Amino acid sequence: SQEVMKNLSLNFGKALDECKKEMTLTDAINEDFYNFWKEGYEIKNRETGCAIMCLSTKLNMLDPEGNLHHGNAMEFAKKHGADETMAQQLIDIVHGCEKSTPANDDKCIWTLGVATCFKAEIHKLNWAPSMDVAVGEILAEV
């Protein structure tokens, strides 16, 4: 897919600003979501996983424990007509990252390992080459 995955961001970072209201977050997570890039750098920012998990909560992407929900996540991918295999990989990547990612005292940090491992898998999968503008907007790049 690749495009469908960017494109499906109808509300995906629209609602960042609601979570940024609700949790009084700062506005640099707007960079953190905007194409992870790098090769293997877990960004130092931590409030990002809080915003991520807030979105995943509102989007019913997770079970009420915090494991991801395969079919509920799949329904988000089906919206534009993703690839069946890409949609299933982006689920299995969770099942892989969580298998490595131990535990943490803070569910934002718990998420962030998995959250970064997701963008890592997409990178080594050769599904994020040089396209840029994946989640975000262009509002005087400076």
Side-chain angles (χ1 to χ4, degrees), residues 71-114:
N72 240 42
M74 181 182 180
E75 282 200 278
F76 197 99
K78 88 123 278 206
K79 218 100 297 176
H80 211 76
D83 288 337
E84 167 176 87
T85 291
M86 194 186 187
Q88 179 61 94
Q89 288 280 121
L90 270 51
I91 288 158
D92 208 19
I93 287 165
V94 194
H95 174 231
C97 297
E98 280 185 356
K99 149 282 234 283
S100 196
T101 305
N104 194 268
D105 253 44
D106 190 286
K107 271 219 278 180
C108 311
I109 283 58
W110 183 85
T111 270
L112 255 149
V114 179

